[PDB]
């Protein structure tokens, strides 16, 4: 099995990137266990917004890390070739496991 984990800060980008992977697999004639949405990490930051004092004046920020799992059962011959030869959109981290 090829396992592919995708991470991104934007869900539209990650869904585009997964759609590329599944089509690449389903063109090479490979079985794909379709995109599993794994839990979104919400990392939060609270900052004081005044340069000086005013402790109750804050901003709260968040980075959401979206995560998708794709599993390729029965990787064919040019299946792996087409996935390792794929420039997904900038802003998507792709980790491939064998």
């Amino acid at each position: 099995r090829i396992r592919i984990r995708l991470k991104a800060f934007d869900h539209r980008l990650i869904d585009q990137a997964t759609a590329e992977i599944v089509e690449t697999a389903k063109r090479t004639g490979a079985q794909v266990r379709g995109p599993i949405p794994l839990p979104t990490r919400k990392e939060r930051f609270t900052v004081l917004i005044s340069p000086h004092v005013n402790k109750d004046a804050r901003d709260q920020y968040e980075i959401r890390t979206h995560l998708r799992l794709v599993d390729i059962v029965e990787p064919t011959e040019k299946t792996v070739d087409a996935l390792m030869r794929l420039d997904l959109a900038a802003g998507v981290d792709v980790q491939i496991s064998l």
């Binding site: 800060f9 934007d10 919400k42 939060r44 930051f45 900052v47 004081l48 917004i49 340069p51 901003d59 709260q60 920020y61 968040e62 980075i63 959401r64 890390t65 802003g91």
Partner: peptide, 21 residues
């Protein structure tokens, strides 16, 4: 620092970071 984070955040210079509710 908290100050430069905020300035960068509002200009869209910190990827993925936005105001949270």
């Amino acid at each position: 620092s908290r100050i430069k984070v905020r300035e960068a955040a509002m200009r869209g210079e910190i990827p993925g970071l936005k105001k949270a509710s």
